[PDB]
Design a binder for this molecule. Structure first.
Ligand SMILES: O=c1[nH]cnc2c1ncn2[C@@H]1O[C@H](COP(=O)(O)O)[C@@H](O)[C@H]1O
Ligand SMILES: [Mg+2]
Ligand SMILES: [Mg+2]
Length: 245
């Protein structure tokens, strides 16, 4: 009788990068009367909290908050100790990756460069040829050039070949950047901790559950009952069907 409903955020509970619709938020608390609820998203905690409430409301509204794919975890209001990428990969491979990226970017000539070309996060390194500290206009300008020249795509091809067999994965999306993360540090990462919390059933809901999507792995994992949704309204409807028939 112990059930967790675990939700992707962008396009599953909220419009992408935007605040949750109050009506959806209301349903989630209603659902909470029957099951525990949780979110897992690739973004950092600050971004997730921003979309799901004011201040740190998110950690009171949800029983679990998994940011950066679960490498950061809040469980019933309490922050757990974080996993760092350097402990998993080791300093030598991490620095090999960093230096390859620095060397590669040094040779790229762009309309503009700024700063934060390599952002060190808990769950990944984010690599941006223009640099993350660029304005909106600068970002769009880079993006247009990127599509014409396949700048990020070529960089990722070179990276994958160089590190073949070494257990690194690379994101396929993004606008001015791409993600580098250890194999298994997709959304499945949060499942290891959840394994210990005595749930009879964990239902996962996501809008990117086809191959290539950032929900595919957690959706397909045998530890979850998987649900594919197309919008927050679809998500609410699915939960109504299953939990309030
Ligand atoms: O494949 C993707 N799917 C979802 N998010 C991504 C993907 N690739 C990068 N991101 C994240 O999306 C955010 C915004 O991307 P940006 O437009 O390149 O800054 C960054 O924090 C990235 O880590
Ligand atoms: Mg999504
Ligand atoms: Mg599954």
């Amino acid at each position: 009788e112990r059930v967790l409903c675990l939700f992707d955020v962008d396009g599953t509970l909220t419009p992408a990068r935007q605040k949750i619709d109050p009506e959806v938020a209301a349903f989630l608390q209603k659902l909470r009367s029957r099951v525990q609820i949780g979110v897992v998203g690739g973004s950092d905690y600050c971004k997730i909290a921003e979309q799901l409430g004011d201040g740190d409301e998110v950690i009171e509204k949800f029983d679990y908050v998994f940011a950066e794919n679960g490498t950061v975890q809040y469980k019933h209001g309490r922050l757990l100790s974080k996993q760092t990428i350097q402990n998993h990969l080791g300093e030598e491979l991490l620095q090999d990756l960093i230096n390859f990226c620095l060397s590669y970017m040094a040779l790229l000539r762009l309309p503009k460069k700024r700063g934060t070309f390599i952002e060190f996060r808990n769950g990944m390194l984010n690599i941006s040829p223009i640099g993350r500290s660029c304005t909106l206009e600068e970002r769009i300008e880079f993006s247009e050039l990127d599509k014409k020249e396949k700048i990020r795509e070529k960089f990722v091809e070179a990276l994958k070949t160089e590190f073949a067999g070494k257990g690194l994965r690379f994101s396929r999306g993004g606008m001015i950047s791409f993600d580098v993360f250890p194999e298994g540090w997709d959304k499945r990462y949060c499942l290891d901790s959840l394994d210990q919390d005595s749930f009879d059933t964990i239902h996962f809901f996501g809008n990117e559950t086809s191959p290539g999507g950032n929900d595919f792995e957690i959706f397909a994992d045998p530890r979850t009952v998987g649900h594919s949704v197309v919008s927050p309204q679809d998500t609410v409807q699915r939960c109504r069907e299953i939990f309030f028939p």
